[PDB]
Short mmCIF file of all heavy atoms in Angstrom, two decimals:
data_model
loop_
_atom_site.label_atom_id
_atom_site.label_comp_id
_atom_site.label_asym_id
_atom_site.label_seq_id
_atom_site.Cartn_x
_atom_site.Cartn_y
_atom_site.Cartn_z
N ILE A 1 1.26 -10.15 23.22
CA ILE A 1 2.45 -9.47 23.72
C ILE A 1 2.55 -8.13 23.01
O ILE A 1 2.86 -8.07 21.82
CB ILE A 1 3.71 -10.32 23.50
CG1 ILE A 1 3.56 -11.68 24.19
CG2 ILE A 1 4.94 -9.59 24.02
CD1 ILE A 1 4.72 -12.62 23.94
N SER A 2 2.27 -7.05 23.73
CA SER A 2 2.24 -5.71 23.17
C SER A 2 3.55 -5.00 23.51
O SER A 2 3.73 -4.52 24.63
CB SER A 2 1.03 -4.94 23.69
OG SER A 2 0.98 -3.63 23.14
N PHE A 3 4.45 -4.95 22.53
CA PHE A 3 5.70 -4.22 22.71
C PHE A 3 5.43 -2.73 22.64
O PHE A 3 4.89 -2.23 21.65
CB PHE A 3 6.71 -4.64 21.64
CG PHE A 3 7.17 -6.06 21.77
CD1 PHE A 3 6.49 -7.08 21.13
CD2 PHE A 3 8.29 -6.38 22.53
CE1 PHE A 3 6.91 -8.39 21.25
CE2 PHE A 3 8.71 -7.68 22.65
CZ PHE A 3 8.02 -8.69 22.01
N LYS A 4 5.81 -2.01 23.70
CA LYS A 4 5.51 -0.59 23.78
C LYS A 4 6.23 0.17 22.68
O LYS A 4 7.40 -0.08 22.40
CB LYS A 4 5.91 -0.04 25.15
CG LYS A 4 5.46 1.39 25.40
CD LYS A 4 6.04 1.94 26.69
CE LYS A 4 5.63 3.39 26.90
NZ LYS A 4 6.29 4.03 28.07
N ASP A 5 5.51 1.11 22.06
CA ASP A 5 6.03 1.91 20.95
C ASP A 5 6.47 1.03 19.78
O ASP A 5 7.33 1.42 18.99
CB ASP A 5 7.19 2.80 21.41
CG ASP A 5 6.77 3.82 22.45
OD1 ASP A 5 5.59 4.23 22.43
OD2 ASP A 5 7.61 4.21 23.28
N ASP A 6 5.88 -0.16 19.66
CA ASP A 6 6.22 -1.08 18.57
C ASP A 6 5.05 -2.03 18.35
O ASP A 6 3.93 -1.76 18.79
CB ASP A 6 7.53 -1.82 18.87
CG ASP A 6 8.35 -2.07 17.63
OD1 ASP A 6 7.76 -2.31 16.55
OD2 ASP A 6 9.60 -2.02 17.73
N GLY A 7 5.31 -3.15 17.68
CA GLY A 7 4.25 -4.04 17.24
C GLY A 7 3.76 -4.96 18.35
O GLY A 7 4.06 -4.79 19.53
N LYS A 8 3.00 -5.97 17.92
CA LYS A 8 2.37 -6.92 18.83
C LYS A 8 2.64 -8.35 18.38
O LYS A 8 2.76 -8.63 17.19
CB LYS A 8 0.85 -6.71 18.91
CG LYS A 8 0.40 -5.30 19.24
CD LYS A 8 -1.09 -5.28 19.52
CE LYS A 8 -1.54 -3.90 19.98
NZ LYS A 8 -2.84 -3.96 20.70
N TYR A 9 2.73 -9.25 19.36
CA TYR A 9 2.71 -10.68 19.11
C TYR A 9 1.34 -11.23 19.49
O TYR A 9 0.78 -10.85 20.52
CB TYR A 9 3.78 -11.42 19.91
CG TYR A 9 5.21 -11.32 19.40
CD1 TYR A 9 6.24 -11.95 20.08
CD2 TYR A 9 5.52 -10.62 18.25
CE1 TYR A 9 7.55 -11.88 19.64
CE2 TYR A 9 6.83 -10.54 17.79
CZ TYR A 9 7.84 -11.17 18.49
OH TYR A 9 9.14 -11.10 18.05
N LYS A 10 0.81 -12.12 18.66
CA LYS A 10 -0.35 -12.93 19.01
C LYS A 10 0.03 -14.39 18.89
O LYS A 10 0.49 -14.83 17.83
CB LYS A 10 -1.55 -12.61 18.11
CG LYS A 10 -2.27 -11.30 18.44
CD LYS A 10 -3.66 -11.28 17.82
CE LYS A 10 -4.26 -9.88 17.79
NZ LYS A 10 -4.46 -9.29 19.15
N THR A 11 -0.14 -15.14 19.98
CA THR A 11 0.32 -16.52 20.06
C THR A 11 -0.81 -17.43 20.51
O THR A 11 -1.68 -17.03 21.29
CB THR A 11 1.51 -16.67 21.01
OG1 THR A 11 1.12 -16.28 22.34
CG2 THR A 11 2.68 -15.80 20.56
N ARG A 12 -0.77 -18.67 20.02
CA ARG A 12 -1.67 -19.73 20.44
C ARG A 12 -0.88 -21.03 20.52
O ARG A 12 -0.24 -21.43 19.54
CB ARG A 12 -2.86 -19.89 19.48
CG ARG A 12 -3.85 -20.95 19.91
CD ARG A 12 -5.00 -21.09 18.92
NE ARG A 12 -6.09 -21.88 19.48
CZ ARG A 12 -6.18 -23.20 19.40
NH1 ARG A 12 -5.23 -23.89 18.78
NH2 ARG A 12 -7.21 -23.83 19.93
N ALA A 13 -0.92 -21.68 21.68
CA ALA A 13 -0.09 -22.85 21.94
C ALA A 13 -0.92 -23.99 22.49
O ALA A 13 -1.91 -23.77 23.20
CB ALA A 13 1.05 -22.52 22.92
N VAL A 14 -0.51 -25.21 22.16
CA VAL A 14 -1.12 -26.43 22.67
C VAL A 14 -0.07 -27.11 23.54
O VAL A 14 0.87 -27.72 23.03
CB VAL A 14 -1.62 -27.35 21.55
CG1 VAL A 14 -2.08 -28.68 22.13
CG2 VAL A 14 -2.74 -26.68 20.77
N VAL A 15 -0.23 -27.00 24.85
CA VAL A 15 0.65 -27.65 25.81
C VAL A 15 -0.06 -28.90 26.31
O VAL A 15 -1.16 -28.81 26.85
CB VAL A 15 1.02 -26.72 26.97
CG1 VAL A 15 1.97 -27.41 27.93
CG2 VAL A 15 1.63 -25.43 26.44
N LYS A 16 0.57 -30.06 26.12
CA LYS A 16 -0.04 -31.32 26.54
C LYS A 16 1.05 -32.38 26.54
O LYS A 16 2.19 -32.14 26.11
CB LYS A 16 -1.19 -31.72 25.62
CG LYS A 16 -0.74 -32.34 24.31
CD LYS A 16 -1.91 -32.60 23.37
CE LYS A 16 -1.45 -33.42 22.18
NZ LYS A 16 -2.50 -33.49 21.13
N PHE A 17 0.69 -33.57 27.02
CA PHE A 17 1.60 -34.70 27.02
C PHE A 17 1.44 -35.53 25.75
O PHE A 17 0.35 -35.65 25.20
CB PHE A 17 1.36 -35.59 28.24
CG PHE A 17 2.16 -35.20 29.45
CD1 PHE A 17 1.67 -34.26 30.35
CD2 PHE A 17 3.40 -35.77 29.70
CE1 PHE A 17 2.40 -33.90 31.47
CE2 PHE A 17 4.13 -35.41 30.82
CZ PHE A 17 3.63 -34.48 31.70
N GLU A 18 2.56 -36.10 25.31
CA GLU A 18 2.57 -37.07 24.22
C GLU A 18 3.50 -38.20 24.66
O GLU A 18 4.72 -38.06 24.59
CB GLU A 18 3.02 -36.45 22.90
CG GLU A 18 2.05 -35.45 22.31
CD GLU A 18 2.51 -34.91 20.97
OE1 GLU A 18 3.51 -35.42 20.43
OE2 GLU A 18 1.87 -33.97 20.46
N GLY A 19 2.92 -39.30 25.12
CA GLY A 19 3.73 -40.29 25.79
C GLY A 19 4.21 -39.72 27.11
O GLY A 19 3.43 -39.14 27.88
N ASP A 20 5.50 -39.87 27.39
CA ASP A 20 6.09 -39.28 28.59
C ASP A 20 6.63 -37.88 28.36
O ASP A 20 7.22 -37.30 29.28
CB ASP A 20 7.21 -40.18 29.12
CG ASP A 20 8.34 -40.35 28.13
OD1 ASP A 20 8.20 -39.89 26.97
OD2 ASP A 20 9.37 -40.94 28.50
N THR A 21 6.44 -37.32 27.17
CA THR A 21 7.03 -36.04 26.80
C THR A 21 5.98 -34.94 26.88
O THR A 21 4.86 -35.11 26.41
CB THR A 21 7.62 -36.11 25.39
OG1 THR A 21 8.65 -37.11 25.36
CG2 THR A 21 8.22 -34.77 24.99
N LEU A 22 6.35 -33.82 27.50
CA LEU A 22 5.51 -32.63 27.55
C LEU A 22 5.82 -31.78 26.32
O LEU A 22 6.96 -31.37 26.12
CB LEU A 22 5.76 -31.85 28.84
CG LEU A 22 4.77 -30.77 29.29
CD1 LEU A 22 5.05 -29.44 28.60
CD2 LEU A 22 3.34 -31.22 29.05
N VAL A 23 4.80 -31.52 25.51
CA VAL A 23 4.97 -30.88 24.20
C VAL A 23 4.27 -29.53 24.21
O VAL A 23 3.17 -29.38 24.75
CB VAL A 23 4.42 -31.77 23.07
CG1 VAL A 23 4.67 -31.13 21.71
CG2 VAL A 23 5.05 -33.16 23.13
N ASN A 24 4.92 -28.54 23.58
CA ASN A 24 4.38 -27.19 23.45
C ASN A 24 4.53 -26.75 22.00
O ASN A 24 5.64 -26.43 21.56
CB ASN A 24 5.11 -26.22 24.39
CG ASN A 24 4.64 -24.78 24.22
OD1 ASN A 24 3.50 -24.52 23.84
ND2 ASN A 24 5.53 -23.83 24.52
N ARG A 25 3.43 -26.74 21.26
CA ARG A 25 3.42 -26.34 19.85
C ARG A 25 2.71 -24.99 19.73
O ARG A 25 1.56 -24.86 20.15
CB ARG A 25 2.73 -27.39 18.98
CG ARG A 25 3.36 -28.78 19.08
CD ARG A 25 2.67 -29.76 18.15
NE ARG A 25 2.81 -31.14 18.59
CZ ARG A 25 3.78 -31.96 18.21
NH1 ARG A 25 4.71 -31.54 17.37
NH2 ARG A 25 3.82 -33.20 18.67
N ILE A 26 3.40 -24.01 19.15
CA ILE A 26 2.93 -22.63 19.12
C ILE A 26 2.87 -22.13 17.69
O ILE A 26 3.71 -22.50 16.85
CB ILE A 26 3.83 -21.70 19.96
CG1 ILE A 26 4.23 -22.37 21.28
CG2 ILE A 26 3.13 -20.38 20.23
CD1 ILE A 26 5.63 -22.96 21.28
N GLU A 27 1.88 -21.29 17.40
CA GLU A 27 1.85 -20.45 16.22
C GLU A 27 1.91 -18.99 16.65
O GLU A 27 1.19 -18.59 17.57
CB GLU A 27 0.59 -20.70 15.38
CG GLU A 27 0.48 -22.11 14.81
CD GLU A 27 0.13 -22.11 13.34
OE1 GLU A 27 -0.73 -21.31 12.93
OE2 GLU A 27 0.73 -22.91 12.58
N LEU A 28 2.76 -18.20 16.00
CA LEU A 28 2.98 -16.81 16.37
C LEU A 28 2.85 -15.92 15.14
O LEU A 28 3.37 -16.25 14.07
CB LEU A 28 4.37 -16.62 17.02
CG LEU A 28 4.81 -15.24 17.51
CD1 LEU A 28 5.75 -15.39 18.70
CD2 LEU A 28 5.50 -14.44 16.41
N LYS A 29 2.16 -14.80 15.31
CA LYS A 29 1.99 -13.81 14.25
C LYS A 29 2.25 -12.42 14.82
O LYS A 29 1.61 -12.03 15.81
CB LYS A 29 0.59 -13.89 13.64
CG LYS A 29 0.30 -15.20 12.91
CD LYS A 29 -1.17 -15.33 12.57
CE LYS A 29 -2.01 -15.48 13.83
NZ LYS A 29 -1.69 -16.73 14.56
N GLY A 30 3.18 -11.70 14.22
CA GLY A 30 3.55 -10.37 14.68
C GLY A 30 3.22 -9.32 13.63
O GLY A 30 3.50 -9.51 12.44
N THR A 31 2.63 -8.21 14.07
CA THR A 31 2.16 -7.17 13.17
C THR A 31 2.57 -5.80 13.67
O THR A 31 2.87 -5.60 14.85
CB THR A 31 0.63 -7.22 13.00
OG1 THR A 31 0.01 -7.04 14.28
CG2 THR A 31 0.18 -8.54 12.40
N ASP A 32 2.58 -4.84 12.74
CA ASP A 32 2.75 -3.41 13.03
C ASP A 32 4.09 -3.11 13.70
O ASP A 32 4.19 -2.18 14.50
CB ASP A 32 1.60 -2.89 13.91
CG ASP A 32 0.24 -3.20 13.33
OD1 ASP A 32 0.14 -3.33 12.09
OD2 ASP A 32 -0.72 -3.32 14.11
N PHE A 33 5.12 -3.88 13.37
CA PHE A 33 6.43 -3.65 13.94
C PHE A 33 7.21 -2.65 13.10
O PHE A 33 7.17 -2.67 11.87
CB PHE A 33 7.21 -4.96 14.04
CG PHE A 33 6.88 -5.77 15.26
CD1 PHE A 33 5.96 -6.81 15.18
CD2 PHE A 33 7.49 -5.51 16.47
CE1 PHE A 33 5.66 -7.56 16.30
CE2 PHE A 33 7.19 -6.25 17.59
CZ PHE A 33 6.27 -7.28 17.51
N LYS A 34 7.93 -1.76 13.78
CA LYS A 34 8.76 -0.78 13.10
C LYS A 34 10.06 -1.44 12.64
O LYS A 34 10.73 -2.12 13.43
CB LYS A 34 9.04 0.40 14.03
CG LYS A 34 7.79 0.92 14.72
CD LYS A 34 7.97 2.32 15.30
CE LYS A 34 8.99 2.34 16.42
NZ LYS A 34 8.95 3.62 17.18
N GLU A 35 10.41 -1.25 11.37
CA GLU A 35 11.49 -2.02 10.77
C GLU A 35 12.84 -1.72 11.42
O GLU A 35 13.73 -2.59 11.42
CB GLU A 35 11.55 -1.77 9.27
CG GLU A 35 10.47 -2.50 8.47
CD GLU A 35 10.72 -3.99 8.38
OE1 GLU A 35 11.88 -4.43 8.59
OE2 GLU A 35 9.77 -4.74 8.08
N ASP A 36 13.01 -0.53 11.98
CA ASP A 36 14.23 -0.24 12.73
C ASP A 36 13.90 0.10 14.18
O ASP A 36 14.41 1.08 14.72
CB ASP A 36 15.01 0.89 12.07
CG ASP A 36 16.51 0.65 12.12
OD1 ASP A 36 16.97 -0.33 11.49
OD2 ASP A 36 17.23 1.43 12.79
N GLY A 37 13.04 -0.71 14.80
CA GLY A 37 12.80 -0.64 16.22
C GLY A 37 13.70 -1.60 16.98
O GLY A 37 14.63 -2.20 16.44
N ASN A 38 13.40 -1.74 18.27
CA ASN A 38 14.22 -2.60 19.12
C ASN A 38 14.15 -4.06 18.68
O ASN A 38 15.10 -4.82 18.91
CB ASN A 38 13.77 -2.47 20.58
CG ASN A 38 14.02 -1.09 21.13
OD1 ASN A 38 15.01 -0.44 20.79
ND2 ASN A 38 13.12 -0.62 21.99
N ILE A 39 13.05 -4.47 18.05
CA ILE A 39 12.84 -5.87 17.71
C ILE A 39 13.40 -6.15 16.32
O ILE A 39 14.35 -6.93 16.16
CB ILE A 39 11.35 -6.25 17.80
CG1 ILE A 39 10.88 -6.28 19.25
CG2 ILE A 39 11.11 -7.60 17.15
CD1 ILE A 39 10.50 -4.93 19.83
N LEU A 40 12.81 -5.53 15.29
CA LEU A 40 13.27 -5.78 13.93
C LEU A 40 14.67 -5.24 13.69
O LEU A 40 15.39 -5.74 12.82
CB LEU A 40 12.28 -5.19 12.92
CG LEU A 40 10.98 -5.98 12.74
CD1 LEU A 40 10.07 -5.27 11.75
CD2 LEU A 40 11.28 -7.40 12.28
N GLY A 41 15.07 -4.22 14.45
CA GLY A 41 16.42 -3.69 14.36
C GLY A 41 17.46 -4.43 15.17
O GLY A 41 18.64 -4.08 15.09
N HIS A 42 17.06 -5.43 15.96
CA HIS A 42 17.97 -6.24 16.76
C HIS A 42 18.80 -5.38 17.71
O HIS A 42 20.03 -5.35 17.66
CB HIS A 42 18.87 -7.10 15.87
CG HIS A 42 18.15 -8.21 15.17
ND1 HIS A 42 17.28 -7.99 14.13
CD2 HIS A 42 18.17 -9.55 15.37
CE1 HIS A 42 16.79 -9.15 13.71
NE2 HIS A 42 17.32 -10.11 14.45
N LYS A 43 18.10 -4.67 18.59
CA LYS A 43 18.73 -3.77 19.55
C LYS A 43 18.55 -4.23 20.99
O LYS A 43 18.88 -3.49 21.92
CB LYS A 43 18.18 -2.35 19.39
CG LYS A 43 18.32 -1.78 17.99
CD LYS A 43 17.62 -0.43 17.90
CE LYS A 43 17.50 0.04 16.46
NZ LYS A 43 16.68 1.28 16.34
#
């Protein structure tokens, strides 16, 4: 996920069933974000 004029998200998820439940487990890493941008600045 490349936020324009800001940082990036890289995600990897395992979507599968566990019993009758559909499970989505994700790891997310974000880099190069501007500390007072739309994301880190909560705008």
Side-chain angles (χ1 to χ4, degrees):
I1 302 176
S2 181
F3 293 89
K4 188 188 178 186
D5 297 331
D6 215 326
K8 307 189 175 200
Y9 284 179
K10 284 198 195 297
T11 61
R12 182 181 193 272
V14 173
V15 181
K16 79 186 189 190
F17 271 88
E18 291 183 8
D20 61 353
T21 299
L22 195 277
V23 183
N24 176 28
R25 303 183 205 268
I26 318 101
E27 297 228 318
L28 181 149
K29 295 169 293 296
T31 59
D32 307 333
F33 278 97
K34 313 197 294 193
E35 283 287 340
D36 219 65
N38 295 324
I39 289 83
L40 285 178
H42 290 72
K43 304 174 191 173

